[model samples]
Target: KKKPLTQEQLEDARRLKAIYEKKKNELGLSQESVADKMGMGQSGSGMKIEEGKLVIWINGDKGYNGLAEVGKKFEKDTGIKVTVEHPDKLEEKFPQVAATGDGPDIIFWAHDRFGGYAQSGLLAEITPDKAFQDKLYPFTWDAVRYNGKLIAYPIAVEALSLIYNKDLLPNPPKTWEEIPALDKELKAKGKSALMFNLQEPYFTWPLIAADGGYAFKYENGKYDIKDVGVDNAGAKAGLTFLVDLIKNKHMNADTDYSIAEAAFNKGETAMTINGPWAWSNIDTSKVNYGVTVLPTFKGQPSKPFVGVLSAGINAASPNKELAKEFLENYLLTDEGLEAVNKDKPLGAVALKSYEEELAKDPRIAATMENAQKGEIMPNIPQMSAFWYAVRTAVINAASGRQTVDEALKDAQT
Candidate 1:
């Protein structure tokens, strides 16, 4: 090839050169093969091409290795050139570039984080054809589908429940107050009853709210942001439970979620709040373990925020149809199920009929049973306020940041 005859020609050559570079990094496919592999029959072809050709970015956490594994499979199976990049600074970077259109093509953050994306009009709504819609759980499907349009693909569904060391207590306490009594017994035994991250709101709010203390109101399937219920009697009572836990140091404010999980796995702690994602790190075979839906608060079952992460279609891509087709074939298949099963038992949203085998894991079965009563952490535009306030209140109440009532009220504002 000869040198370009003009600046315009040189620019075209450079642009084409960059496209090839991105495609190589993403899918390792040539242009002609990519077209043949990601034909119209495939849903991801257009997205692959649009993203591959344009070099758009996608973001998520390091915990989603299963999604990443399947993502690579989807790219290879459908020939979509998608560059998977995980920046440790996504939390810091996403907000700065959000308004300038320099942000990623996809994000793997929690459903709770979706609000800011939608409000900025930076997120592309995903509206897959009929086949894709039919395969997902109704609530799971609706969680990712905002404003009557799908915005992200469903990855996994998650929520917190109580996990206890069987060696310490075969049947853990059924109420919040009993935690301290157990802790007293453990302290006498030179051990801890339950260790917790008094600093994390995700762990405490459900504990407090099980007694009918809700930070926000939900009516007719929508959340009422203006109705701040932080100081309601049940909410206060829930906070009081944590205050007692902290006052006696029954739960450790310095212990993070990982530390708590470690303490339980080592048979040093009796119980703690955690989800399926924690299973990968703990070797359950070494110890007898028990999992339960968090205990009730005055006869009402404690319900925690449920997280549903799924694969979504990006609208602006020319390869939308192809991307959807690819997701259906590869990411939603038996092989895909096996891929996800290998790590933690992230429940399948497709409602597959393979339950008999899946239920063998007692803890997983229990988690799913609880999931039946689960509700999606709201995906509405203003839901962030509730999440932040509730989280802050939980952490504060657990660590004595303020009176649970005062903390919640402050969080509400």
Candidate 2:
């Protein structure tokens, strides 16, 4: 018992009805399927756009496989074909393809690289709904924003944690003072007390951060790249401690990533400083392990740099509306977020609800605690320079090529 339609209303209805019918056939979908995809409500109000394919370019890893699987759900619901491509060297190739106007609709990457992409105008600014934004942790927002605008959807939080072999040391040490006692006991059993990739600056950063040394100063809600802190007194204090560790033969300076991880897996080391990604390589049967935040160094708790993983839309994509819909409506949901994390079991996600679920798992909960205590990885473009600069200082000091002061001074230049 509705009123009769006027000429103008009738014409509008016919136009939309035709479009929906055409889209239904083009998408190989039924009317009810198309209506559901359009998000039809009781009032019958919803989007009437045509169904088309959405292509995404992402890294070829287990994480991306999880994402692709989620895309399958989106495809099934919307009748929108989802094509996922894993290109070689995505960091290098994405810009080239985007510039050529042949890039995919969306790109998956870490937030540290977001600055470079946003500065290059390759990423579209995304103003997601408050519901979506409210679900995320506050720290994650700093990395996702560029030029005071949100540009990416944060997915997971990544930070380093202390991973220990439970069988070797039933209860991990709470302070550095306990390390020596444990080292003596473990060494007698033909295993080292602690091991890590000494040559990698990433692994060494927590110790330096414990002393308050940082690559850049965050002032007034922005990073001051000119005020580098890598050569300050804090840096000297940290590097000196590491150098002393090497000089005293406590840990080997030649230990690299592979060596440290292999030793830990083979139960040759009782403890190691590593990140969540190392979980995949661990043989659980051979080495029962537990994860915890890094122990205190000189009465100060160790803090690692927390990196965030995110996804962004290509600025030039013609399907931005669809891309945004997919990111906000589909990807951010609890079901969707869990699928992404369940496949690879990466670090904890930024969403509070999912985070609560992630906390139930001991390994993820430990890493989440570290993330809460850690410093956010700088997202400024100048961060690139900081990596190479401090890496040299670490190498020189650890190898006895230069004094801690001299190596850090050289890094400042």
Candidate 3:
């Protein structure tokens, strides 16, 4: 274990850190741009040999006990002690506690949540070099950034795909045109050809984007929230398509996460739009499942939203430098990722080599392909708020309470 520094040593380290911060601010790297200084190898090795313990807070996924093993291996590599804990309500409490100096050295979670945290100064911006950046997929990095400033290190990535039971429906539809015949055949057998939970923008995005719709028009370096497409012609067409499914008796308006999963598990669903997170919970003995991309719609691929699970450093940690070192040396390496995989399987790995290695498994292969093809979900504040109104639109439109156009306008509002 790393020996804790004495009070004097701690004070000296703090003083040096303050000087570094001052120098960084003077160089226009603080609250502005890390781009100018991102590749400076001269300043990159700003390491001081100091380590005590690295505290990490993760969500309650016991599968990440693999991460605990990754940490165990890191502790073996370095003398630092590593503690991985499942803290309660990290999303609600992290900002409040960390602003006052009580939080873990690292927080590993979804990519979208860090945008507000980075802007709020609760996160330390990361600068991965171009060569290092080239190691992982660009979309993963894009998902973890805010206004081009990197906020986290992507460990795993995920995206939605067409998950089907081969025994129930041997051939899945490849286009919206094919859905009609498949729908009839499936219904004749008392099963659904597709069972997507349409409660939120996440699952419903392919519907809109397939018809050329978008949440916000992202240009140059910024998102034009005013260019909202919730009521665009393509978007209206997409919603019309969804409502048409209900009219054709292919899907029910009340079908949501609970009922969809229930239908899927019972072999009543031929296919569903889902991600890597859904497979383990399914019993394969009863259902021979396969993974592939969503069918084409309006001559466009039914691409789903992409997200990454990333790791970030708490700006308040005293061991910030060591935290950076640990992340660079252990967490982002091939050996390190494998250690975690040793405990449990990773979904879509950030690194290209590991992604290729993991693709030996069919689920990883298909999901990773869709992740590469899909658009990264913009994590800007506008996108987060976009969900509330959009969900209402889908609920109204799918249930016939509002005309498709009216529901689209509600989403725009």
Candidate 4:
């Protein structure tokens, strides 16, 4: 007679049985063959069997196609079932769920949230092997680390790049000073030279950052929140330039995302500040556009904050080890990373090998070019406070409701 199994063992056996049956019915392939195809060691590969299943919450619904491919490979290789979910506004909903120790085993999101989540005790510590670390770009660590621990695995990088209409202006402005000439030329044609969502700091930050303004001073490879730079002289100079543009009727404070995107798509604006996420909105055939890094400001190259797309495991998960193996060993690998981007092109992944391949695509290459010259957005809890404060200051100064000094001073306080 078979030996009696413990409750935990019985539960694990049931899950394993389910996985085998599902694979047989769906894939019609043996476990060993599946593992080999996915580039994993046969039978008893480094993957753990404890988890039985993984429930992952990702931010974008479009990610489903990519992750579904990953999930299929994961199940085939480890005899584990994987379910991917995209909840609306996951960033806002996650904290509430995590507080109750009730959330997905894995969460995929932007690296900016890593600090707040890790600090809140929602993220598990991820100490990937040296081989895994060596495969990724050194700069990627800047966004993945929180309190000196790698809290997540980076997947792709995004930064603002200057996108211009090829028909209106064959060449983009090379410096901030050239904007006036472009404005004059466009105004004569009843058009705007440039337009962007000025009310949001994310889009406007490059202007401030190029002139020595920063969210926090990065020193000794870490951010010093005590040394906020949003109200510094450089910030005022940058904000003042924007105010002049508004006063001269080059652009307006009321130009929100919808307006800016519509204007650009409709050919009413010759240029705009946007990212890959907005690519689908443009009717490419009608718009003939090109992208380049932002122009110089005061002789310094304008730098946008690089946003990293990454995945983190829940700290309270019972399947932490399994999650780590899945993320670090499987998902972050060259084959796995490529699978994630197979459906729709995203920014380049951190691996030099992956980036080399990604750069062959002109669109992905343009984003990679911009990200290379950008600053990684600080992954710290204080950033939450920084966003709202700076956005309020940007709008106040740009709209003429407050002086640059007064608006920035209010933000700093």
> lDDT of each model, Cα atoms only?
0.65, 0.80, 0.77, 0.81
Of 2 and 3, which scores higher on TM-score? 2
Per-residue alpha-carbon lDDT of candidate 3 for residues 255-339, written as tens digits (9 for 90 to 100) = 8876777788778888888767667656443788888877888877876667787888887666877777778778778887887
Prediction 2 TM-score vs. true: 0.78
lDDT of 2: 0.80
| Clashes in predicted model 1 | 23
User: Can you write out model 1's per-residue Cα lDDT over 325-401, one digit (the tens) per residue?
Assistant: 55566656667756756755664344353334566777767677666655567777666666667777677666666
Alpha-carbon RMSD of each model: 11.0, 14.7, 12.6, 13.8
The numbered model that scores best in lDDT is 4
Question: Model 1 off-target regions past 4 Å?
Answer: 1-50, 53-63, 81-86, 89-98, 312-323, 348-360
> Per lDDT, what order, best first?
4, 2, 3, 1
Q: Cα lDDT of model 4 overall?
A: 0.81
Candidate 2 per-residue C-alpha lDDT over 1-413 given as tens digits, one digit per residue, 9 for 90 to 100:
68877999989999999997888888878645756678674422222222366888766543566778878999899978777788877867877767645577888877877787788888899877777788888878878888898888887788889999999998999876567677878888898789899876888888887877888888898788788888888778878888887887778878888888889999999999887657766745389999997887778887788878788888777778889888777777788787766555668887778788778888987897887777878777766567778888999899999999999998895
| Candidate that would win on TM-score | 4
Per residue, candidate 4 scores C-alpha lDDT tens digits across 334-398 of 78777766654456778778788778767777776777666888888877789889999999988
The count of residue-pair clashes in candidate 2 stands at 0
- After the best TM-score superposition of candidate 1, give how far the Cα of residue 248 lies from its true spot, in angstroms: 1.4
